[PDB]
Scaffold this active site. Structure first.
Site, PDB file in Angstrom:
ATOM      1  N   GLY A 166       0.785  -1.258   0.000  1.00 44.34           N
ATOM      2  CA  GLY A 166       0.000   0.000   0.000  1.00 44.34           C
ATOM      3  C   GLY A 166       0.810   1.299   0.000  1.00 44.34           C
ATOM      4  O   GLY A 166       0.427   2.295  -0.630  1.00 44.34           O
ATOM      5  N   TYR A 173      -9.482   0.782  -4.922  1.00 41.50           N
ATOM      6  CA  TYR A 173     -10.608   1.088  -4.053  1.00 41.50           C
ATOM      7  C   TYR A 173     -11.897   1.196  -4.859  1.00 41.50           C
ATOM      8  O   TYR A 173     -12.079   2.162  -5.643  1.00 41.50           O
ATOM      9  CB  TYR A 173     -10.400   2.438  -3.383  1.00 41.50           C
ATOM     10  CG  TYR A 173      -9.239   2.530  -2.440  1.00 41.50           C
ATOM     11  CD1 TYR A 173      -7.972   2.805  -2.913  1.00 41.50           C
ATOM     12  CD2 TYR A 173      -9.412   2.398  -1.062  1.00 41.50           C
ATOM     13  CE1 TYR A 173      -6.900   2.928  -2.039  1.00 41.50           C
ATOM     14  CE2 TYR A 173      -8.347   2.517  -0.195  1.00 41.50           C
ATOM     15  CZ  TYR A 173      -7.098   2.771  -0.686  1.00 41.50           C
ATOM     16  OH  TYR A 173      -6.034   2.882   0.149  1.00 41.50           O
ATOM     17  N   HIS A 184      -6.869  11.728   8.352  1.00 40.06           N
ATOM     18  CA  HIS A 184      -5.543  11.166   8.518  1.00 40.06           C
ATOM     19  C   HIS A 184      -4.533  11.897   7.669  1.00 40.06           C
ATOM     20  O   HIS A 184      -4.896  12.442   6.618  1.00 40.06           O
ATOM     21  CB  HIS A 184      -5.531   9.697   8.103  1.00 40.06           C
ATOM     22  CG  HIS A 184      -5.778   9.469   6.646  1.00 40.06           C
ATOM     23  ND1 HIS A 184      -7.042   9.448   6.108  1.00 40.06           N
ATOM     24  CD2 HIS A 184      -4.925   9.205   5.620  1.00 40.06           C
ATOM     25  CE1 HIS A 184      -6.956   9.203   4.808  1.00 40.06           C
ATOM     26  NE2 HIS A 184      -5.682   9.054   4.486  1.00 40.06           N
ATOM     27  N   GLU A 186      -0.726  10.686   5.933  1.00 39.22           N
ATOM     28  CA  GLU A 186      -0.278   9.375   5.446  1.00 39.22           C
ATOM     29  C   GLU A 186       0.654   8.719   6.422  1.00 39.22           C
ATOM     30  O   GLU A 186       1.133   9.372   7.329  1.00 39.22           O
ATOM     31  CB  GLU A 186       0.314   9.458   4.033  1.00 39.22           C
ATOM     32  CG  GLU A 186      -0.697  10.027   3.028  1.00 39.22           C
ATOM     33  CD  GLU A 186      -1.945   9.139   2.797  1.00 39.22           C
ATOM     34  OE1 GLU A 186      -1.745   7.940   2.507  1.00 39.22           O
ATOM     35  OE2 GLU A 186      -3.121   9.618   2.875  1.00 39.22           O
ATOM     36  N   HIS A 272      -6.602  14.730   5.482  1.00 39.47           N
ATOM     37  CA  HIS A 272      -7.717  14.655   4.553  1.00 39.47           C
ATOM     38  C   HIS A 272      -8.733  13.629   4.966  1.00 39.47           C
ATOM     39  O   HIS A 272      -8.448  12.772   5.747  1.00 39.47           O
ATOM     40  CB  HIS A 272      -7.259  14.369   3.113  1.00 39.47           C
ATOM     41  CG  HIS A 272      -6.365  13.176   2.981  1.00 39.47           C
ATOM     42  ND1 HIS A 272      -5.005  13.250   3.216  1.00 39.47           N
ATOM     43  CD2 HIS A 272      -6.623  11.892   2.644  1.00 39.47           C
ATOM     44  CE1 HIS A 272      -4.466  12.066   3.015  1.00 39.47           C
ATOM     45  NE2 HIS A 272      -5.425  11.224   2.673  1.00 39.47           N
ATOM     46  N   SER A 284      -4.260   4.093  -5.670  1.00 39.12           N
ATOM     47  CA  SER A 284      -3.279   4.962  -4.955  1.00 39.12           C
ATOM     48  C   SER A 284      -2.075   4.245  -4.440  1.00 39.12           C
ATOM     49  O   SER A 284      -2.111   3.017  -4.264  1.00 39.12           O
ATOM     50  CB  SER A 284      -3.890   5.683  -3.728  1.00 39.12           C
ATOM     51  OG  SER A 284      -4.350   4.752  -2.776  1.00 39.12           O
TER      52      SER A 284
END
Ligand SMILES: COc1ccc2c(c1)CCC[C@H]2CNc1cnccc1C(=O)O
Ligand code: NI
Ligand SMILES: [Zn+2]
Length: 347
Positions: A166, A173, A184, A186, A272, A284
């Site tokens: 990830g 997604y 959160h 990253e 975000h 992503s």
């Protein structure tokens, strides 16, 4: 006024094919223009460019671990628990998403849908096909390939062979209406790249890194329990806070909607959140620039359970500071308004 400051509001960029072909330098370009200070930027790729010919050939693709998103709370403050479900194919996911029970409600303009989202997120818990390993890019696409961005984040793998699912690899997604991601930054306060391959839009809230501490303070205030237990509890990716609450408590933030075919770049220490409008598919992963290394050294991490050893980064890019840093006497203070050094050419 800190509220409205456009130097910290979400920018959109429309690169030419020429500028689009060099990924890492366009990122420095958009920082040269202030993109970073919002914590979130849209990049609309040039029109001819397509990462995949057709999306008609993924009906049988397995979503190994779909999650059902139960949300609990009131008064703009919520906690999302992801309950694991049986594996289903994309085809079966599309079916549930488009059905009467889960489809996008009727609405005129985005504000109405936004109100419907915050009014009903605790009801009728949707399924999110989140964190599927895989990529929908065709093998041969050399522009903005989320499976191989070739930034300095790849230094861990050059030296050790170690990857982290990830962060160093790509995730897909599959959203349906009302599926959410919490507030959160990253992992390791890295950058992230998110490309909506197809379907209905994804809307995003972002807080500017220069104001991120305010969001933490709000979150501590209203979840002291969670904060006793773990100084970095936002990193659990379970906490939703409405735009009304942010406004009310003086947290500057901005909003934007991502449409099929558009990229969103999140920046170091950019908080975000958001939700999907309806059936859609986004890819992503994480990446880095030279500016990130300090964010990596200083990142406040989950104290109660993902971790990148910064040693290698400081060794290679900050050689003189290394010993001073291992001593624990390196009190470099981050200026969140500054562009990455790779931007210097664009002046
Ligand atoms: C450990 O708990 C977690 C971890 C990850 C997630 C969730 C829960 C909820 C589903 C979304 C994902 C995260 N999803 C995103 C994160 N950042 C930007 C965009 C998204 C997205 O869902 O599109
Ligand atoms: Ni994210
Ligand atoms: Zn924790």
């Amino acid at each position: 006024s800190e509220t409205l400051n456009p130097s910290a509001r979400i920018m959109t960029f429309y690169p030419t094919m020429e500028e689009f072909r060099n990924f890492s330098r366009y990122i420095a370009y958009i920082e040269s223009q202030g993109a970073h200070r919002a914590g979130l930027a849209k990049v609309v790729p040039p029109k001819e460019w397509k990462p995949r010919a057709s999306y008609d050939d993924i009906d049988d693709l397995v979503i190994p671990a779909p999650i059902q998103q139960l949300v609990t709370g009131q008064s703009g403050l919520f906690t999302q628990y992801n309950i694991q479900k049986k594996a289903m194919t994309v085809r079966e996911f599309r079916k549930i998403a488009n059905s009467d029970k889960y489809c996008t409600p009727r609405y005129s303009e985005f504000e109405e849908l936004e109100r419907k989202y915050w009014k009903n997120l605790t009801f009728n818990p949707p399924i999110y096909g989140a964190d599927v390993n895989g990529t929908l890019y065709e093998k041969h696409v050399d522009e903005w390939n989320i499976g191989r961005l070739r930034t300095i984040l790849d230094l861990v793998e050059k030296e050790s062979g170690i990857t982290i699912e990830g962060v160093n690899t790509p995730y897909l997604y599959f959203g349906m209406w009302k599926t959410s991601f919490a507030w959160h930054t990253e992992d390791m306060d890295l950058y992230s790249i998110n490309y909506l391959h197809f379907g209905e839009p994804k809307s995003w809230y972002s807080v500017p890194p220069e104001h991120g501490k305010r969001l933490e303070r709000l979150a501590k205030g209203f979840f002291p329990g969670s904060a006793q237990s773990c100084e970095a509890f936002l990193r659990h990716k379970m906490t939703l806070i409405s735009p009304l609450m942010l406004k009310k408590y003086g947290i500057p933030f901005d909003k934007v909607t991502q449409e099929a075919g558009e990229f969103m770049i999140t920046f170091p220490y950019g908080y975000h959140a958001g939700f999907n409008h309806g059936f859609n598919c986004a890819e992503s992963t994480n990446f880095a620039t030279r500016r990130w290394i300090e964010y990596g050294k200083q990142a406040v991490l989950c104290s109660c359970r993902v971790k990148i050893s910064m040693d290698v980064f400081v060794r290679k890019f900050q050689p003189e500071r290394y010993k001073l840093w291992k001593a624990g006497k390196d009190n470099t203070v981050i200026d969140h308004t500054l562009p990455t050094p790779e931007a210097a050419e664009f002046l």
